[PDB]
Symmetry: C5
Subunit: 103 residues, 5 copies
């Protein structure tokens, strides 16, 4: 299995690593129909989303998707610094695939 | 996908943005039958609810409804400031569709 | 939909409001068969429970019962002050229907 | 229903109350097959477990088992003082049936 | 049932104990398809993973795998020191079977 987020990210096309090194500036969560998602922004001006579960997600990703949103909420509330985000760049906002945090 | 809560809110009928910019004043949670819900209030005098799951909700919203309630509880307990709320105004109290929080 | 704990409590047959205005003194949790419940007490001596799921409960209450127990634990662990509790008074300990907290 | 952990514990066979009055010394969690459990210890030299789910458990206990493990973890991480433990003494280490915390 | 992580670790093949006595240096979480996992690192330079659920896991481990990931996130966020890890050494990075922490 991959040993670092970069290793993991390099396994998928249409992805790139954003080296955030910062806490989340804003957290947005929606339970509106067809828009059950989370959006986060940073002081850098970058915006990212955890996508609404859909056709392109495999079954195994369902729990992971819910975990990622849990992670973003607690990271926001605790002001925990995010190191890097591996994101798909074929979506707007860019779509979160993986996250890493360094202490 | 929407980039902000304002963009997200604009996609729906009967919704509107309430700029809160304040922490929750009161949190109420009910496990009484047909009233399995959460009610939040602000010192401005505005009251909002996360609705009891009903037939208007689609399947993808079920986990989202539970998430929103989780978020309100931790937001209240931590005295975290809420920036905006996108709410359905055809319900009383106004029904929460989405929330945004900024540091 | 109800806008306060008193309003939802008043919808009921055999309930009453308890003004607590205090943090929880003790928290008890059981995973023993047929006694899967939570019991909390206050310095006043008053004792309450979140009942074991049973035939008197409608299906939509199942998830809410688990949420209420989650709330009581984090409320206890954070020493958060409870405002009021709506309880069904035909059970001992008095059975929690709803909880409210303000700060 | 029972008013206290001691009253609840007495409703069962092969159980007894351990007065701990102390925070958890160590926490051990396993996801190894057939050993999916939690083990805790105290400065007193006592060791306890939340058993691996099995035939001895009834359906209503499944979520309760998961809840107890959640409680032990958060109790350990917050250095929360445990009052009493109701344990089954026909298992080694003794098996947790209920827990109480007082502040 | 085993009384310590050492006793537990010894019941499986291809495992070994890693004495850590340190907080997690980095935490990585992925929701990418086929890579739904968590990777943790320590200042020692060691790297461990919670494997993607697969054919090597039995039913009972599914909830345990998700719990382990929950434990790693909260342990990382709280800078809690990890005492030891029981890992399967037939995977790269070494795969977490159990974890222990002492206060
Ligand atoms: N095998 C494979 C092929 C495509 C792929 O990406 C697609 O799915 C992702 C969600 O899983 C993102 O939505 C991304 O934007 C989509 O383009 C991921 C894996
Ligand atoms: N397609 C579609 C489906 C539902 C809908 O709104 C209804 O459901 C909302 C929750 O989903 C709110 O309860 C709102 O008050 C209702 O009016 C609008 C459009
Ligand atoms: N119409 C109606 C519905 C429920 C009701 O309360 C019953 O259910 C409660 C939990 O839902 C408590 O268990 C209470 O002790 C029971 O008496 C009373 C009237
Ligand atoms: N009806 C009933 C049946 C068994 C019982 O105890 C058994 O199950 C417990 C788990 O629930 C503990 O594992 C205990 O060690 C076992 O002896 C209690 C009540
Ligand atoms: N009975 C039995 C047989 C094999 C076994 O190990 C395999 O599964 C583990 C997770 O369950 C790890 O993935 C390990 O690396 C695999 O080798 C565990 C138990």
């Amino acid at each position: 299995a991959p040993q670092t987020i970069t290793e993991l990210c390099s396994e998928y096309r249409n992805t790139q690593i954003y080296t955030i090194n910062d806490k989340i500036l804003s957290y947005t969560e929606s339970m509106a129909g067809k828009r059950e998602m989370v959006i986060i922004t940073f002081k850098s001006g970058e915006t990212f989303q955890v996508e609404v579960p859909g056709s392109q997600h495999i079954d195994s990703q369902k729990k992971a998707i819910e975990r990622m949103k849990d992670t973003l909420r607690i990271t926001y509330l605790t002001e925990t610094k995010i190191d890097k985000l591996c994101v798909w760049n074929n979506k707007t906002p860019n779509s979160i695939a993986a996250i890493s945090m360094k202490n």
